[model samples]
Target: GCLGDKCDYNNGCCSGYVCSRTWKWCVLAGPW
Candidate 1:
């Protein structure tokens, strides 16, 4: 994966990863 990625309700992230805040960054599925 790469940084500066974009994600949202329509654009889900990879396994174990989720889209961060409006910044659209990929982060771990745990916590925030």
Candidate 2:
């Protein structure tokens, strides 16, 4: 998981969304 200034692991990402560890995109569990 991504934890940094650019990535808000709590308030930024929505439910079922996670911060990308390699990029600046949000990760989800399914076909998005």
Candidate 3:
């Protein structure tokens, strides 16, 4: 997965994604 990577709510995302606690999701696009 790129941005919307899945985990136990994103296990810190993998690589191209950033875990977003606020959104409770990951965003590979950026820190948006």
How much RMSD separates candidate 1 from the native structure? Answer: 2.5
Residue lDDT tens for model 3, 2-24: 66665455277766776666666
Task: TM-score for candidate 2, please give it.
Answer: 0.40
- Candidate 2 on 1-32: residue-level lDDT in tens? 63332464554865666677677556664764
**Model 1, span 1-32: residue lDDT tens:** 74456776657666777777768766666663
Model 1 spans with C-alpha error above 4 angstroms:
2-4
What are the lDDT scores of the predictions, listed in order?
0.68, 0.59, 0.62
- Which residue pairs come into collision in candidate 2? none
Please give the range of 10 consecutive residues that has the lowest summed lDDT in model 2.
Answer: 2-11
**CA displacement after TM-score superposition, residue 3 of candidate 3 (Å):** 2.7
Top TM-score: which candidate number? 1
Candidate 1 accuracy as lDDT = 0.68
True lDDT of residue 6, candidate 2: 46
lDDT of 1 at 10: 57
Task: Identify the runs in model 3 with alpha carbons over 4 angstroms from their true place.
Answer: 6-12, 29-32
| Ranking of models by TM-score | 1, 2, 3
